[PDB]
Design a protein around this ligand. Structure first.
Ligand SMILES: Nc1ncnc2c1ncn2[C@@H]1O[C@H](COP(=O)(O)OP(=O)(O)O)[C@@H](O)[C@H]1O
Ligand SMILES: Nc1ncnc2c1ncn2[C@@H]1O[C@H](COP(=O)(O)OP(=O)(O)O)[C@@H](O)[C@H]1O
Ligand SMILES: Nc1ncnc2c1ncn2[C@@H]1O[C@H](COP(=O)(O)OP(=O)(O)O)[C@@H](O)[C@H]1O
Ligand code: BEF
Ligand code: BEF
Ligand code: BEF
Ligand SMILES: [Mg+2]
Ligand SMILES: [Mg+2]
Ligand SMILES: [Mg+2]
Lengths: 370, 151, 168, 400, 362, 370
């Protein structure tokens, strides 16, 4: 067995290769206390990690060590990996290879320090660093398609044909569920309700995860919510009081299809997918159009597969069929795909091994993992 | 040193193939006469074009024994010559009418023809092998595996 | 490939599937030991007659069989000295891996290019219809594998000729 | 037989030493490393080896070391390493020369078979001898090749970059029932020096810097709990080492208790492995006591050191004193039961001028002998029996 | 006829026996263990292992009325296992005095003695003495020339058929005094002391299987040449009334069972039982009991995702390796009565080298 | 049964003597992956050949190893013969004597090397190297005629009378269906469709096959298409985009009649045929004009028989018959003619046999073949 540790920017998703689904899913958060620690003894800790922080958050400054899929704070990222292996999986990491992941078009130094900490702190016996939108394509049961992965921090497209990636046609967009959370705070502020702190940012994430949905036709949905009760509904806070919301429920997800709302100049996710298909060689485009693959938690909004199929069918030539593949387990497909990969018998030849790291130094990942 | 001196060969006499298969009752000259009368019937059946009646009559007796290679080889020469002179579309009409005893004499000698390609055309024996096994079933090879070694 | 080998490989497939009727058998000459009786040959009543299947003077199979073991040995096409070297070496890689192709011998029988030993334990713990499909799919493809290697040898003979000759 | 100087190749896990018999040093000593890529196919022509393949890590080649724990274990890489050794560096014709190759005592027969088929079928060499490497290293001890300078009885302790093994030899015969082997040597102590620099988080811990800190700074102390205590009392023992990075800038490394705790891997191998628990002085006593009784005075009297990882400052004296302690304690138990005295046994551990490459100098000195062409596998024997001609162990007792 | 797959065993199952209540069965895995399986509602569960043998177990049997298991192995031992009142099994070593492996064992119909075939050229007929609490072995040895591949007892306690690798099927008297009552004067003989020979019948290949008719007045046996032979004896020293050999078109039979006085099921390397029918005038193969004789989208599971990639990686391509059309996927090693009155088998069972244990109803 | 291959400069046609048409017809192409394989488990393969390369082409750089009827990359030509023998016909090359086919006025080195490969790499029992135009008279059932063969790589005339060829009057022209694809790619740019890659070349080859024709008078057809949409057609790319095509529909094949379009200085196929007949002896011209035989795929354009009859009737003397026999099977007529030649009772003495080659070396071919 080998660990598969998809340290995403919003959730760590971890477990064992060939296991059905990730067994350690928790916030990619380190919390530190912000108040007068008056009661002596009491089992107090200098910092808290994951669900241990999320449940204590009313006294903590929660901060994610990872932003837009790039590690910003290594002293806390080691704290998350240590929590993953010793507290959440309860293994010794020196006994198991780890398949890690990262998004494409990351800094070189991210990939180096992430191999160095696995070999020099966690003492791991072998490791590998897969591209997240390649893994999501194993989890679809395919060898050609265009994975749209979108998580908490990054959205990216990787077009693949016959198992060859077309790396010139990879699109990264630094917009995903954390920007939709920050935008939901900016529009909730307009109805009556103020959310400000790093802990209140989790309450509005827990709104976004169950009140929001994607409108199939935003400009007509906007007129319908401005003229009826049916689109409005309510959520009950930790403080027992009720929050009622309406056109905020679909204006939030719409930022993915209209990044101009949060001040970005870019294509939306629909036109970013088409700009990746139209960068590919002309003979493969039909087999990409019939195999768009949704992945990552930001693709979980009710109606996003219907909307994505509508917007791509308007951009694509009407002569040919579009399919969006969106399984119900697309919430974890990058982990699911790493759990396939780390169990394929040729894969056991591809690991960076401890001995090979010791001899080659941390630059070995650049001449073995892609 | 002593480790290599065999003793089993001189203190525990093993079985012989004539203990496992009953020895032939007909004497060497008695089968050499019995074959030498049949080969001219097979050679004649080719010369009159009725090669299929050549095989039916040639296959009515079979020579066997470690004493008779100089006439087992003549019987095999006549049999391979007769197989090389039957039209491939007539084979399914011959094979479906052979007894299981005659079939087990055909396929036994085609595996003797296939053992000596520098004297026999394999291409026609492999063609007979496909047709005899497809029509009469895989057990007809198993009866060759199990058959007498001096056939 | 297939169409020229089709008469031959249907004779080999049919012989080899009739030959692979193996069983557990404790040896009669040694106590508390099983041995692959085709390979030892010390008790004759549990050997079956050795059968040859053959297309040509070059291309042949010898099939030897016993109550718990079958040995199968083949000569493949070698029509020039480049195929003699390419075959003789290719089979030494293929038999050098015999610990992981469980049915291979590590040495051929004398005068054969490669040889297989399908023992009872293999027909109990492996799919025996996929064993003959591997033997046959090896005999179809090995002529295409070796002929392709004599193309790559010509390709390098050109690589070194052009690279030497183009720096005058 | 051809008359041409036999070619000698000690392919170590760390260094290959190459040359021709009868020269006064190896023609080359360079790392056993190959640099490889990681419309005609040429990725098997683009490789480099030795000192010219360290220069290639920045040019995007992957370096790999085809010998690990004293055994060849990548045969594609080792064949390309030999062709390039023979045709670039030694610049020889294999069909004209006998070759002496070396391997450890406990190598698998499969590796001698693969070595023989590569030498006879790929290169077509005239003939081959595959020498057990520590059996040669005794012959580097002599003051000269001449018969009166020989001392054909002595234990030989060999320790390179990848294996240490102790071979007893007496009256010119290798006592094969008594060989001891331990796959812990110069590289495993480098990974330990590297592991310590890395736990202190020093500016550089690349393999080349731990390899240099071993042979610059490390030594074998008497006892590590007193040496840790000395590093508190005696603060000039924390050396400062200046290392230059892979990318061409300065650094400074403080070197600490690895100055003694790293060579201690030989005298306490529990530090390195769960599997090889027996320390080198007791591993040597197990060799000499397993050996037949009349040669034991001769085997202790002349314990030859060999191979680069025996060169640590104070290594010979630590081995001599810890082995003399094991030996005189055992003799004094025997004086106790008898009440009579004994003459004891003298234990000498012999460090000497050719200790850095003793196996090569041993191979060179043996291969000059007129009989050598008769001990080789000649290619005439290869064409008769095939590569199985090399499969039999010369050293151990064989059944059949 | 219908097939029901009772259990899939993790290892090859050369032999088995169901107890007389058909509630539990013993079976020989291809190791020195013997498994005991019990009912689990409609399923079966592993109850215990016997493990008293040194080397691979070769055969096993379970006495109907007296409820004792007997076991053979390549270690040359046999054990008899008998139920203690507390619910566990008392092992007991039987001194077979064999120079080479024990191959095949059967309890006699009165269960007072059992016979063990061997590679040692002999058969050890074993019986128990209340005077000594020993099991003691008598060696049948005069005509046997090679390994004994199978045994069957006549429905009267005396006569023993044995199939031998010297291409012959023997009928021997195994009368042991002060155990058996006198044998009745019958088609096979009347002058009938231990090791007297009633037949040395020929075969084209090794005789894998033997069995007397339910009336005892005929013997059937089966060759590695893929033929079944039925021998109809006349009297001592006299040729048989008929020696009917039917040659099958299939791979060899390994096991054999009279369904009634006029029909036989047989099975082996053909992966399927077959039915033969006839009498002393003639016999023919008449049916295959397996319908496999005729050779007869939605969401996708994680284990189908992982296995379609492991198939592309380990094998040629994604596509699954097919089943055989027969119920068994490998040679069917043994074939045993299950239900109906003695001499009218209504159902039988088989166990395979694939580890299937299967119930067949006619 | 002998084999016969027309190793065409753009399609391989291969089969057995006495069949009515080729057993295998496939592009004379070899392709290598241009991208990096990211999937494991996939059957990654270092080169594809024939129809598999044409099918996977969106990730391949495609090479033709024959240029102007001359083999220029031998390694990728040996791959194509190994594909014809072991994969397409699937018969071992040692079993059957084999008729190869070649254009006139080729390098001597091309026919020697093609002999040396067949006897020393494919070990064939016998072979012969017939001239492609001489086989077109066998297919047409003639013994007197002037062939006009035109393939992918080359166009040539061989005039023949009562079976005697006139090798001084052979005209050969390195302009045929490849240079028409290269020119159609160029003029397609003038309507705005940029095709650039070795795979888009195979889309523009298909446009040329599906839509082009030879216009009976070019200045009249130009003045027609300049006024009207009636001559236009539309083709759906494998991308589902539709291109629409104008006077470049017939300005492409006119390159055969006006080589100055592609800058080269030569007579068009009409004048080069008339010059071949005017080089011939005066008594035979009167029959060469009556038995003018076309062959090869570049002679398949609609209206090319009527264009060719109109132009030869304008050049040749008006007092006598011009009669062009362009049969409906003419796409394969070199192979069909080869399958007749190799089947003749009188040809079985004319093979170069292996025993006769190795006593003389490959220079035997020039003293048994034409
Ligand atoms: N049901 C849902 N509806 C909308 N957003 C969701 C839903 N489930 C998860 N998310 C969002 O997905 C993000 C986490 O997705 P994930 O794929 O695990 O990201 P990452 O890999 O970067 O950690 C968070 O922003 C979370 O709120
Ligand atoms: N002075 C020294 N002190 C300690 N180790 C040394 C010294 N000089 C060289 N070495 C070590 O010797 C080893 C190489 O010895 P060598 O005999 O060539 O080994 P090998 O034969 O296995 O390659 C390396 O570990 C090297 O760092
Ligand atoms: N129907 C057609 N119409 C126009 N051009 C054609 C047609 N069919 C094939 N071609 C062209 O003819 C060439 C192939 O003809 P072929 O006779 O096989 O040439 P070659 O023998 O040299 O390979 C290619 O350029 C192809 O595009
Ligand atoms: F880091 Be998550 F994939 F956005
Ligand atoms: F490989 Be070295 F000899 F340790
Ligand atoms: F062979 Be094509 F006619 F150039
Ligand atoms: Mg993610
Ligand atoms: Mg060394
Ligand atoms: Mg052509």
């Amino acid at each position: 067995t080998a660990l598969v540790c998809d340290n995403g920017s919003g959730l760590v998703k971890a477990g064992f290769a060939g296991d059905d689904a990730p067994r350690a899913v928790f916030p990619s958060i380190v919390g530190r206390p912000r108040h007068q620690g008056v009661m002596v003894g009491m089992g107090q800790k200098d910092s808290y990690v994951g669900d241990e922080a999320q449940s204590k958050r009313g006294i903590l400054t929660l901060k994610y060590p990872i932003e837009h899929g790039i590690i910003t704070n290594w002293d806390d990222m080691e704290k998350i990996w240590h929590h993953t292996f010793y507290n959440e999986l309860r293994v010794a990491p020196e006994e198991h290879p780890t398949l890690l992941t990262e998004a494409p078009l990351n800094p070189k130094a991210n990939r180096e320090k992430m191999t160095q900490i696995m070999f020099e702190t966690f003492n791991v016996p072998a490791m590998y660093v897969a591209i997240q939108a390649v893994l999501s394509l194993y989890a679809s049961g395919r060898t050609t398609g265009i994975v749209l992965d979108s998580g908490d921090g990054v959205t990216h497209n990787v077009p693949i044909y016959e198992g060859y990636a077309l790396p010139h046609a990879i699109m990264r967009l630094d917009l995903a569920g954390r920007d939709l959370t920050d935008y939901l705070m900016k529009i909730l502020t307009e109805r009556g309700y103020s959310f400000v702190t790093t802990a209140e940012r989790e309450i509005v994430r827990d709104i976004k995860e169950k009140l929001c949905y994607v409108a199939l036709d935003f400009e007509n949905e906007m007129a319908t919510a401005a003229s009826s009760s049916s689109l409005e509904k309510s959520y009950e806070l930790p403080d027992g009081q009720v929050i009622t919301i309406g056109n905020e429920r679909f204006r939030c997800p719409e930022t993915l299809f209209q990044p101009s709302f949060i001040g970005m100049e870019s294509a939306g996710i629909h036109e970013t997918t088409y700009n990746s298909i139209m960068k590919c060689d002309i003979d493969i485009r039909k087999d990409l159009y019939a195999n768009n693959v949704m992945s990552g938690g930001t693709t979980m909004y009710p109606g996003i597969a219907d909307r994505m199929q509508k917007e791509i069918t308007a951009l694509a030539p009407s002569t040919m069929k579009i399919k969006i593949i969106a399984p119900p387990e697309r919430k974890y497909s990058v982990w699911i795909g790493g759990s396939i990969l780390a169990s394929l018998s040729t894969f056991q030849q591809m690991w960076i091994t401890k001995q090979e790291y010791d001899e080659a130094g941390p630059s070995i990942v650049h001449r073995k993992c892609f | 040193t002593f480790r290599t001196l065999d003793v089993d060969s001189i203190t525990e006499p093993v079985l012989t193939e004539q203990d496992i298969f009953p020895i032939r009752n007909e004497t060497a000259e008695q089968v050499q006469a019995a074959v030498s009368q049949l080969i001219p019937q097979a050679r004649s059946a080719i010369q009159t074009g009725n090669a299929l009646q050549g095989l039916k009559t040639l296959l009515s007796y079979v020579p066997y024994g470690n004493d008779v290679q100089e006439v087992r080889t003549q019987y095999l020469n006549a049999f391979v010559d007769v197989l090389s002179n039957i039209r491939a579309a007539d084979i399914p009409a011959f094979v479906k009418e052979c007894s299981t005893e005659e079939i087990d004499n055909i396929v036994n000698f085609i595996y003797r023809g296939l053992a000596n390609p520098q004297a026999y055309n394999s291409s026609v024996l492999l063609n007979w092998h496909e047709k005899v096994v497809e029509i009469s079933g895989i057990g007809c090879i198993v009866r060759v595996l199990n058959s007498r070694p001096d056939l | 490939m297939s169409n020229t080998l089709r008469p031959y490989l249907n004779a080999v497939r049919s012989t080899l599937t009739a030959s692979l009727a193996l069983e557990e058998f404790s040896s009669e000459i040694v106590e508390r030991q099983s041995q692959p009786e085709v390979e030892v040959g010390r008790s004759p009543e549990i050997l079956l007659k050795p059968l040859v299947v053959s297309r040509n003077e070059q291309e042949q199979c010898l099939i030897e069989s016993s109550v718990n073991s079958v040995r199968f040995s083949i000569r493949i096409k070698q029509v020039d000295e480049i195929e003699r070297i390419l075959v003789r070496k290719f089979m030494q890689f293929l038999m050098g891996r015999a610990e992981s192709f469980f049915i291979l011998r590590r040495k051929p029988v004398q005068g054969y290019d490669i040889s297989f030993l399908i023992t009872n334990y293999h027909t109990e713990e492996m799919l025996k219809h996929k064993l003959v499909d591997f033997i046959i799919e090896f005999m179809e493809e090995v002529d295409a594998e070796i002929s392709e290697m004599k193309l790559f040898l010509n390709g390098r003979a050109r690589l070194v000729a052009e690279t030497y000759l183009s720096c005058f | 037989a051809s008359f041409n100087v036999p070619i000698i190749m000690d392919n170590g896990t760390g260094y290959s030493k190459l040359g021709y018999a009868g020269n006064d040093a190896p023609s080359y000593v360079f790392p056993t490393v190959i640099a490889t890529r990681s419309k005609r196919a040429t990725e098997d022509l683009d490789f480099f080896i030795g000192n010219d393949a360290l220069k290639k890590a920045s040019a995007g080649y992957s370096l790999d070391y085809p010998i690990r724990h004293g055994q060849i274990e990548n045969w594609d890489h080792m064949e390309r390493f030999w062709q390039q050794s023979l045709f670039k560096y030694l610049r020889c014709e294999p069909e004209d020369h006998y070759f002496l190759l070396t391997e450890p005592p406990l190598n698998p027969p499969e590796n001698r078979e693969n070595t023989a088929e590569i030498m006879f079928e790929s290169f077509n060499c005239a003939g081959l001898y595959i020498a057990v490497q520590a059996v040669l290293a005794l012959a580097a001890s002599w003051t000269s090749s001449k018969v009166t300078d020989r001392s054909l009885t002595g234990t030989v302790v060999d320790s390179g970059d990848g294996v240490t093994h102790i071979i007893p030899v007496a009256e010119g015969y290798v006592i094969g029932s008594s060989i001891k082997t331990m796959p812990l040597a110069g590289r495993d102590v480098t990974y330990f020096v590297q592991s310590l620099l890395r736990d202190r988080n020093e500016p550089d811990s690349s393999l080349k810097t731990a390899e240099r800190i071993k042979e610059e700074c490390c030594y074998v102390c008497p006892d590590i709990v007193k040496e840790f205590s000395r590093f508190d009392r005696e603060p000039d023992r924390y050396l400062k080492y200046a290392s230059e990075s892979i990318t061409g800038h300065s650094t400074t490394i403080d070197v600490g208790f690895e100055r003694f705790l790293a060579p201690e891997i030989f005298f306490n191998p529990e530090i390195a492995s769960s599997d090889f628990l027996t320390p080198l002085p007791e591993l040597v006593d197990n060799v000499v006591q397993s050996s037949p009784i009349d040669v034991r005075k001769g085997l202790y009297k002349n314990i030859v050191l060999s191979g680069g990882s025996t060169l640590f400052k104070n290594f010979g004296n630590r081995l001599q004193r810890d082995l003399k302690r094991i030996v005189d304690e055992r003799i004094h138990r025997s004086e106790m039961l008898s009440g009579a005295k004994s003459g004891g046994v003298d234990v000498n551990v012999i460090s000497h001028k050719r200790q850095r490459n003793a196996v090569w100098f041993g191979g060179s000195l043996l291969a000059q002998t007129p009989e050598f062409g008769s001990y080789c596998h000649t290619k005439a024997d290869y064409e008769e029996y095939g590569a199985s001609i090399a499969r039999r162990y010369q050293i151990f007792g064989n059944s059949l | 006829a219908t097939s029901q797959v009772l259990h899939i065993l993790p290892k090859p199952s050369y032999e088995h026996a169901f107890n007389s209540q058909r509630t539990e069965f013993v079976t020989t895995t291809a190791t020195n263990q013997v498994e005991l399986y019990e009912q689990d509602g409609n399923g079966w569960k592993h109850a215990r292992t016997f493990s008293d043998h040194d080397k691979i177990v070769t055969c096993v049997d379970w006495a109907p009325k007296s409820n004792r298991i007997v076991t053979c192995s390549q270690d040359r031992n046999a054990y008899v296992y008998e139920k203690r009142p507390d619910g566990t099994w008392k092992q007991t070593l039987v001194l077979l005095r064999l120079n080479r492996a024990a191959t095949f064992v059967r309890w006699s119909p009165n269960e007072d003695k059992f016979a063990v075939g061997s590679g040692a050229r002999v058969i050890s007929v074993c019986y128990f003495e209340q005077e000594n609490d020993w099991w003691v072995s008598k060696h049948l040895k005069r005509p046997l020339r090679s390994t004994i591949l199978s045994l069957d007892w006549h429905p009267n306690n005396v006569l023993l058929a044995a199939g031998c690798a010297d291409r012959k099927a023997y009928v021997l008297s195994a009368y042991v005094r002060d155990v058996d009552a006198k044998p009745e004067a019958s088609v096979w003989g009347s002058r009938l002391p231990f090791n007297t020979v009633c037949a040395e019948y020929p075969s084209g290949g090794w005789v894998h299987a033997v069995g007397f008719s339910p009336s005892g007045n005929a013997l059937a046996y089966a060759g590695h040449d893929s033929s079944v032979t039925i021998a109809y004896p006349s009297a001592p020293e006299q040729p048989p009334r008929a020696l009917i050999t039917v040659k099958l078109s299939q791979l060899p039979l390994r096991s054999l069972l009279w369904a009634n006085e006029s029909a036989i099921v047989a099975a082996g390397y053909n992966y399927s039982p077959i039915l033969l029918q006839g009498n002393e005038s003639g016999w023919a193969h008449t049916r295959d009991l397996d319908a496999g004789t005729s050779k007869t989208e939605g969401p996708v599971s994680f284990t189908a995702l992982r296995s379609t990639f492991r198939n592309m990686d380990l094998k040629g391509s994604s596509q699954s390796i097919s089943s055989l059309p027969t119920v068994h996927q490998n040679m069917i090693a043994t074939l045993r009565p299950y239900a109906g009155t003695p001499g009218n088998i209504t159902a039988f069972t088989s166990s395979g080298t694939d580890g299937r244990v299967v119930l067949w109803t006619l």
